[PDB]
């Protein structure tokens, strides 16, 4: 059992002068992303989009344009610094969707509450020939 931490607005954002690498209309009408982390101090870190920003001591909130930017920055926060991070997807309705770490456990560490998806129980060479799924909507790897 794991309860995703809710996104807390009014969480401070890093010190940064602005860049052309930030959000666009996509964030207004489609979706954007938010990564939060806890920092032990004020540090300089490389922004996945602009140049250099100053991570604030304590909780940090950072809105990014793509999920991959959140995961890249988080990978670095966990690597260069030793910082726990989470990030979420945010729709223009205000709805928030917690994304990562999905279990509260990082996905490279096996966690027992996890259900198999897209797992085929056979060697890859035992997939059927296309002719055997022709005119059916299926793909030989969907089995």
């Amino acid at each position: 059992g794991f309860t995703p931490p809710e996104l807390d607005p009014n969480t401070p954002s890093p010190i940064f002068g602005g860049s052309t690498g930030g959000l666009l209309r996509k964030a207004q009408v489609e979706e954007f992303y938010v990564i939060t982390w806890e920092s032990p101090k004020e540090q300089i870190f490389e922004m996945p989009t602009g140049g250099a920003a100053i991570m604030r001591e304590g909780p940090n909130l950072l809105k990014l344009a793509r999920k991959e930017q959140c995961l890249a920055l988080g990978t670095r926060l966990r690597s260069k610094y030793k910082i726990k991070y989470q990030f979420y997807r945010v729709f223009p309705s205000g709805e928030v969707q917690y994304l990562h770490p999905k279990d509260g456990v990082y996905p490279e560490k096996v966690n027992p509450g996890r259900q198999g998806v897209g797992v085929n129980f056979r060697s890859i060479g035992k997939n059927v020939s296309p002719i055997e799924v022709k005119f059916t909507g299926k793909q030989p790897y969907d089995l």
């Binding site: 890859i124 060479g125 997939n127 020939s129 296309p130 793909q139 030989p140 790897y141």
Partner: protein, 74 residues
């Protein structure tokens, strides 16, 4: 002069034929991509893994052979 150009023409027929035949016989798979039949006639590639796999599809073999055909008919 006709001897020499006839052997160039033989070269073009053999090379174009080599590209197309290898493309057709390796369309279902190779050692680099044994499951190629599962990816269809035309796909970009199979990524930079396993050494790099650009132009590994059968459609790519056609695309390559058209150059040799234009050369031969030239």
């Amino acid at each position: 002069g006709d001897f020499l150009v006839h052997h160039a023409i033989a070269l073009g027929l053999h090379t174009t034929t080599l590209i197309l035949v290898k493309g057709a016989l390796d369309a279902r798979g190779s050692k680099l991509m044994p499951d190629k039949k599962d990816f269809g006639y035309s796909f970009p590639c199979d990524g930079p893994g396993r050494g790099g796999t650009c132009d590994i599809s059968a459609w790519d073999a056609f695309y390559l052979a058209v150059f040799w055909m234009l050369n031969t008919i030239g």
